[PDB]
CSV table of C-alpha atoms and ligand atoms in Angstrom, one decimal:
chain,number,residue,atom,x,y,z
A,603,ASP,CA,-29.9,10.7,2.4
A,604,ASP,CA,-26.0,11.3,1.9
A,605,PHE,CA,-24.1,10.6,-1.5
A,606,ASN,CA,-27.3,8.7,-3.0
A,607,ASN,CA,-26.5,9.4,-6.4
A,608,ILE,CA,-22.3,8.9,-6.0
A,609,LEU,CA,-23.3,5.9,-4.1
A,610,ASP,CA,-25.4,4.7,-6.8
A,611,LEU,CA,-22.7,5.1,-9.4
A,612,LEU,CA,-20.1,3.6,-6.7
A,613,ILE,CA,-22.1,0.4,-6.5
A,614,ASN,CA,-22.7,0.2,-10.0
A,615,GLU,CA,-19.3,0.2,-10.9
A,616,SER,CA,-17.8,-2.2,-8.2
A,617,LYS,CA,-19.8,-4.9,-9.9
A,618,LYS,CA,-17.3,-4.9,-12.8
A,619,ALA,CA,-14.8,-6.3,-10.7
A,620,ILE,CA,-16.6,-9.8,-9.8
A,621,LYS,CA,-15.9,-11.0,-13.7
A,622,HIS,CA,-12.1,-10.8,-12.6
A,623,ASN,CA,-12.4,-12.7,-9.0
A,624,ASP,CA,-12.1,-9.5,-7.4
A,625,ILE,CA,-13.8,-8.1,-4.2
A,626,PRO,CA,-16.7,-5.6,-5.6
A,627,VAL,CA,-14.8,-2.2,-4.6
A,628,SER,CA,-15.5,0.9,-6.3
A,629,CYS,CA,-14.5,4.5,-4.7
A,630,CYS,CA,-14.4,8.3,-6.0
A,631,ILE,CA,-12.4,11.2,-5.0
A,632,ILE,CA,-14.3,14.5,-4.5
A,633,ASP,CA,-13.7,18.2,-3.9
A,634,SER,CA,-15.2,20.5,-1.7
A,635,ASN,CA,-18.1,21.1,-4.1
A,636,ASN,CA,-18.5,17.4,-4.2
A,637,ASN,CA,-17.0,16.9,-7.6
A,638,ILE,CA,-16.4,14.0,-8.4
A,639,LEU,CA,-12.4,13.9,-10.1
A,640,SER,CA,-11.1,10.3,-9.9
A,641,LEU,CA,-13.0,7.3,-10.0
A,642,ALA,CA,-11.8,3.6,-9.5
A,643,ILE,CA,-12.5,-0.1,-9.1
A,644,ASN,CA,-10.8,-2.8,-7.4
A,645,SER,CA,-8.2,-4.9,-9.8
A,646,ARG,CA,-5.7,-6.7,-7.4
A,647,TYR,CA,-6.4,-10.0,-8.7
A,648,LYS,CA,-7.0,-8.7,-12.4
A,649,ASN,CA,-3.6,-7.4,-12.8
A,650,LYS,CA,-1.7,-9.8,-10.1
A,651,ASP,CA,-0.9,-6.4,-8.6
A,652,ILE,CA,-1.2,-6.3,-4.4
A,653,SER,CA,-1.4,-2.3,-4.4
A,654,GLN,CA,-4.5,-2.2,-6.9
A,655,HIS,CA,-7.1,-1.7,-4.5
A,656,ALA,CA,-9.6,0.9,-5.4
A,657,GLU,CA,-8.2,3.2,-3.1
A,658,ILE,CA,-4.7,3.6,-4.3
A,659,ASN,CA,-6.3,3.1,-7.7
A,660,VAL,CA,-8.1,6.4,-7.3
A,661,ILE,CA,-5.0,8.0,-5.6
A,662,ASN,CA,-2.9,7.4,-8.7
A,663,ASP,CA,-5.7,8.5,-10.9
A,664,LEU,CA,-5.8,11.9,-9.3
A,665,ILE,CA,-1.7,12.0,-8.9
A,666,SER,CA,-1.4,11.8,-12.9
A,667,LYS,CA,-4.4,14.2,-13.2
A,668,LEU,CA,-2.8,17.1,-11.0
A,669,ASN,CA,1.1,15.6,-11.3
A,670,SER,CA,1.1,16.3,-7.4
A,671,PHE,CA,1.1,13.7,-4.5
A,672,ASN,CA,-0.9,16.5,-2.2
A,673,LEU,CA,-4.2,15.9,-2.2
A,674,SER,CA,-5.1,17.8,1.0
A,675,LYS,CA,-8.0,19.7,-0.4
A,676,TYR,CA,-9.8,16.5,-1.5
A,677,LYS,CA,-11.8,13.5,0.3
A,678,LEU,CA,-12.3,10.0,-0.6
A,679,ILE,CA,-15.7,8.1,-1.0
A,680,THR,CA,-15.6,3.9,-0.7
A,681,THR,CA,-17.9,1.3,-0.7
A,682,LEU,CA,-16.1,-0.8,1.7
A,683,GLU,CA,-13.9,1.0,4.7
A,684,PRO,CA,-10.3,0.7,3.2
A,685,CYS,CA,-7.8,-1.9,4.5
A,686,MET,CA,-4.3,-0.6,6.5
A,687,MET,CA,-2.3,-0.6,3.3
A,688,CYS,CA,-4.8,1.4,1.6
A,689,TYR,CA,-5.3,3.9,4.9
A,690,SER,CA,-1.5,4.1,5.3
A,691,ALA,CA,-1.4,5.4,1.3
A,692,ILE,CA,-4.7,7.7,1.8
A,693,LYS,CA,-2.6,9.4,5.1
A,694,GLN,CA,0.7,9.8,2.9
A,695,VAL,CA,-1.3,11.6,0.2
A,696,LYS,CA,-2.9,13.9,3.0
A,697,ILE,CA,-6.6,13.5,2.6
A,698,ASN,CA,-8.0,14.2,5.8
A,699,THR,CA,-11.7,12.5,5.4
A,700,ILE,CA,-12.7,9.1,4.3
A,701,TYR,CA,-16.6,8.6,4.0
A,702,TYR,CA,-17.2,4.6,3.9
A,703,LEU,CA,-20.6,2.9,3.2
A,704,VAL,CA,-19.6,-0.3,5.2
A,705,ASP,CA,-17.4,-1.0,7.8
A,706,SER,CA,-14.4,-3.6,7.6
A,707,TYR,CA,-16.0,-5.9,10.2
A,708,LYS,CA,-19.3,-6.8,8.6
A,709,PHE,CA,-17.2,-9.4,6.5
A,710,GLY,CA,-13.9,-9.6,8.3
A,711,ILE,CA,-11.7,-8.4,11.1
A,712,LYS,CA,-11.9,-4.9,12.2
A,713,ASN,CA,-9.2,-2.8,11.2
A,714,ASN,CA,-7.0,-0.8,14.6
A,715,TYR,CA,-6.4,2.7,14.5
A,716,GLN,CA,-6.2,12.8,14.8
A,717,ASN,CA,-5.0,13.6,11.3
A,718,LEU,CA,-7.8,11.6,9.5
A,719,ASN,CA,-11.5,11.7,10.0
A,720,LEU,CA,-13.1,8.1,9.2
A,721,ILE,CA,-16.9,8.7,8.8
A,722,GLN,CA,-19.7,5.8,8.4
A,723,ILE,CA,-22.1,7.1,5.5
A,724,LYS,CA,-25.9,7.3,6.6
A,725,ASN,CA,-27.8,5.5,3.9
A,726,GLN,CA,-29.4,2.2,5.0
A,727,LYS,CA,-31.0,1.5,2.0
A,728,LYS,CA,-27.6,1.9,-0.3
A,729,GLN,CA,-25.7,0.0,2.3
A,730,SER,CA,-27.9,-2.6,2.2
A,731,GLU,CA,-28.1,-3.3,-1.5
A,732,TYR,CA,-24.3,-3.3,-1.2
A,733,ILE,CA,-24.2,-5.6,1.5
A,734,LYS,CA,-26.2,-7.9,-0.4
A,735,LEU,CA,-24.0,-7.6,-3.3
A,736,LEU,CA,-21.3,-8.4,-1.2
A,737,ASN,CA,-22.8,-11.7,0.4
A,738,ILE,CA,-23.9,-12.9,-3.3
A,739,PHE,CA,-20.1,-12.6,-4.4
A,740,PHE,CA,-18.5,-14.2,-1.3
A,741,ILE,CA,-21.1,-17.4,-1.0
A,742,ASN,CA,-20.5,-17.7,-4.7
A,743,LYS,CA,-16.8,-17.7,-4.5
A,744,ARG,CA,-16.8,-20.6,-1.7
A,745,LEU,CA,-18.4,-22.5,-4.3
B,1163,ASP,CA,28.5,-10.4,9.9
B,1164,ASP,CA,25.3,-11.0,8.1
B,1165,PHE,CA,23.5,-10.4,4.9
B,1166,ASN,CA,27.0,-8.4,3.8
B,1167,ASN,CA,27.1,-9.7,0.2
B,1168,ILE,CA,23.4,-8.9,-0.2
B,1169,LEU,CA,23.5,-6.0,1.8
B,1170,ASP,CA,26.2,-5.1,-0.9
B,1171,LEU,CA,24.0,-5.2,-3.4
B,1172,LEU,CA,21.0,-3.7,-2.0
B,1173,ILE,CA,22.9,-0.8,-0.9
B,1174,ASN,CA,24.6,-0.4,-4.6
B,1175,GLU,CA,20.9,-1.1,-6.3
B,1176,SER,CA,19.3,1.9,-4.2
B,1177,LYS,CA,22.0,4.7,-5.4
B,1178,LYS,CA,19.9,4.2,-8.7
B,1179,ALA,CA,16.9,5.8,-7.1
B,1180,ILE,CA,18.6,8.9,-6.7
B,1181,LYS,CA,18.4,9.9,-10.0
B,1182,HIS,CA,14.6,10.3,-9.8
B,1183,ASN,CA,14.7,12.2,-6.6
B,1184,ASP,CA,13.4,8.9,-4.6
B,1185,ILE,CA,14.6,8.1,-1.2
B,1186,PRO,CA,17.5,5.2,-2.0
B,1187,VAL,CA,15.8,2.1,-0.7
B,1188,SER,CA,16.1,-1.6,-2.2
B,1189,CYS,CA,14.8,-4.9,-1.0
B,1190,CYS,CA,15.0,-8.3,-2.2
B,1191,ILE,CA,13.0,-11.4,-1.3
B,1192,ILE,CA,14.9,-14.6,-0.2
B,1193,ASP,CA,13.9,-18.4,0.3
B,1194,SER,CA,14.7,-20.3,2.9
B,1195,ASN,CA,18.6,-21.2,1.4
B,1196,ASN,CA,19.0,-17.3,1.4
B,1197,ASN,CA,18.7,-17.7,-2.7
B,1198,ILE,CA,17.6,-13.9,-4.3
B,1199,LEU,CA,14.4,-14.5,-5.9
B,1200,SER,CA,13.3,-10.9,-6.6
B,1201,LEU,CA,15.1,-7.4,-6.0
B,1202,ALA,CA,13.8,-3.9,-6.6
B,1203,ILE,CA,14.3,-0.4,-5.6
B,1204,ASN,CA,12.1,2.5,-4.8
B,1205,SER,CA,10.8,4.2,-7.2
B,1206,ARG,CA,7.5,6.2,-6.5
B,1207,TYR,CA,8.3,9.5,-7.4
B,1208,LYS,CA,10.1,8.0,-10.5
B,1209,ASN,CA,6.7,6.6,-11.5
B,1210,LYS,CA,4.3,8.6,-10.0
B,1211,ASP,CA,2.8,5.6,-8.4
B,1212,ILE,CA,2.1,5.8,-4.7
B,1213,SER,CA,2.5,2.4,-4.4
B,1214,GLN,CA,5.8,1.8,-5.7
B,1215,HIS,CA,7.9,1.8,-2.8
B,1216,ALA,CA,10.9,-1.0,-3.0
B,1217,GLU,CA,8.8,-3.5,-1.1
B,1218,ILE,CA,5.5,-3.4,-3.0
B,1219,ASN,CA,7.5,-3.6,-6.2
B,1220,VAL,CA,9.3,-6.6,-5.0
B,1221,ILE,CA,6.4,-8.4,-3.9
B,1222,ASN,CA,4.7,-7.7,-7.1
B,1223,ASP,CA,8.1,-9.2,-8.9
B,1224,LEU,CA,7.7,-12.5,-7.2
B,1225,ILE,CA,3.8,-12.2,-7.3
B,1226,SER,CA,4.5,-12.2,-11.1
B,1227,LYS,CA,7.3,-14.9,-10.9
B,1228,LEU,CA,4.8,-17.2,-9.0
B,1229,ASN,CA,1.7,-16.4,-10.3
B,1230,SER,CA,0.6,-16.8,-6.7
B,1231,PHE,CA,-0.6,-14.4,-3.6
B,1232,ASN,CA,1.0,-16.6,-0.8
B,1233,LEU,CA,4.7,-16.1,-0.5
B,1234,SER,CA,4.5,-17.2,3.2
B,1235,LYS,CA,7.7,-19.6,2.8
B,1236,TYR,CA,9.7,-16.7,1.8
B,1237,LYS,CA,11.6,-13.6,3.8
B,1238,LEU,CA,12.1,-10.0,3.1
B,1239,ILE,CA,15.3,-8.0,3.2
B,1240,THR,CA,15.3,-4.1,3.0
B,1241,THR,CA,18.1,-1.5,3.9
B,1242,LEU,CA,15.2,0.8,5.7
B,1243,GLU,CA,12.4,0.0,7.7
B,1244,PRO,CA,9.1,-0.4,5.7
B,1245,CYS,CA,6.2,2.0,6.1
B,1246,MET,CA,2.8,0.9,7.2
B,1247,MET,CA,1.5,0.7,3.8
B,1248,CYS,CA,4.2,-1.6,2.2
B,1249,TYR,CA,4.3,-3.4,6.1
B,1250,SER,CA,0.4,-4.2,5.6
B,1251,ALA,CA,1.3,-5.3,2.0
B,1252,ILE,CA,3.9,-7.7,3.2
B,1253,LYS,CA,1.4,-9.1,5.9
B,1254,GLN,CA,-1.3,-9.4,3.0
B,1255,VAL,CA,0.8,-11.6,1.1
B,1256,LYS,CA,1.9,-13.8,4.2
B,1257,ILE,CA,5.4,-12.9,4.6
B,1258,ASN,CA,6.4,-13.6,8.4
B,1259,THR,CA,9.9,-11.8,8.7
B,1260,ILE,CA,11.1,-8.6,7.9
B,1261,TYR,CA,15.1,-8.0,8.0
B,1262,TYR,CA,16.2,-4.2,8.1
B,1263,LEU,CA,19.2,-2.6,8.3
B,1264,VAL,CA,17.9,0.9,9.3
B,1265,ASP,CA,14.8,1.5,11.6
B,1266,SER,CA,12.4,4.2,10.6
B,1267,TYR,CA,13.4,6.6,13.1
B,1268,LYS,CA,16.8,7.7,12.7
B,1269,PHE,CA,15.5,9.6,9.6
B,1270,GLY,CA,11.8,10.0,10.8
B,1271,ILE,CA,8.8,9.3,12.8
B,1272,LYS,CA,8.9,5.6,14.7
B,1273,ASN,CA,6.5,3.0,13.5
B,1274,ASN,CA,3.9,1.8,15.5
B,1275,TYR,CA,2.8,-1.6,15.5
B,1276,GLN,CA,2.4,-12.1,16.8
B,1277,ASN,CA,2.3,-13.0,13.3
B,1278,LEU,CA,5.4,-10.7,11.8
B,1279,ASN,CA,9.0,-10.6,13.1
B,1280,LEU,CA,10.9,-7.7,12.3
B,1281,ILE,CA,14.6,-7.9,12.9
B,1282,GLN,CA,17.4,-5.4,12.9
B,1283,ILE,CA,20.3,-6.5,10.8
B,1284,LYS,CA,23.6,-6.7,13.1
B,1285,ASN,CA,25.9,-5.3,10.2
B,1286,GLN,CA,27.3,-1.9,11.9
B,1287,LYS,CA,29.6,-1.3,8.6
B,1288,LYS,CA,26.8,-1.5,6.2
B,1289,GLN,CA,24.4,0.4,8.2
B,1290,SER,CA,27.2,3.1,8.8
B,1291,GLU,CA,27.4,3.2,4.7
B,1292,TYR,CA,24.1,3.1,3.9
B,1293,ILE,CA,23.0,5.8,6.8
B,1294,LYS,CA,25.7,8.1,5.2
B,1295,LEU,CA,23.9,7.6,1.9
B,1296,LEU,CA,20.6,8.7,3.2
B,1297,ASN,CA,22.2,11.8,5.1
B,1298,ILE,CA,23.7,12.9,1.9
B,1299,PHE,CA,20.6,12.4,-0.3
B,1300,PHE,CA,18.1,14.5,2.2
B,1301,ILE,CA,20.9,17.1,3.1
B,1302,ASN,CA,20.9,17.6,-1.0
B,1303,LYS,CA,17.3,17.7,-1.5
B,1304,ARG,CA,16.8,20.5,1.0
B,1305,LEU,CA,19.1,22.5,-0.9
C,2760,LIG,ZN1,-6.8,-1.7,0.4
C,2761,LIG,ZN1,6.4,1.6,1.8
């Protein structure tokens, strides 16, 4: 069901990061009516910037659009559960909800954490496609 | 005693952030022989970038200098105890030691946290000067 079109776009965009050896992650920020306002992909290693995960990129995008650091009436949708750096960045701009498709433990160590709802997206098919994408990425990099 | 000259430089540099309404924070990264390799100040609101705290700025500086994300044989010296976003960024580049002059609770909420030593700098005089700086900043902004 949920976010089928949005997840289609995010999954398709996350592939663009594989060129530059970045983990394929993409995310967007939506308003109360599920309109996408900002879209971003992971570009840390592409631009040699420790901060340029997809989450911080989309946050900075909406900040530039609104000329405001208060993003409290928007929500974030990401393909992969954010890291603690990006999690803290999300809480500092006052976004109260993170929808994620794949949790942080399927490919790594679980994150340890009130003011922020962390919701798993129910869409086994999109989740399966994206997990396939990540598996291919990691095994092709171990090469 | 400790880091008297380095703290003099950091405190003097942190003043440059007050122009652009940024919290006066400055930091550097040193090697095993206490040579400064990278120096940075806080510029979040100056450049509308949620990530541009002084810690992430100095990390990105050293990354550009070394063309490497492995900073495990360097340590970080900051005037103010880092936030959790910057803390996670520091741990992700594998810096194992953070020297801080003023802890996070004197002006805010205490941070809640192994692989990372968090050391308070013993220098009551520099600490007093910097605390004075921060007090003047915050009260002048409440205006
Ligand atoms: Zn992240
Ligand atoms: Zn910070």
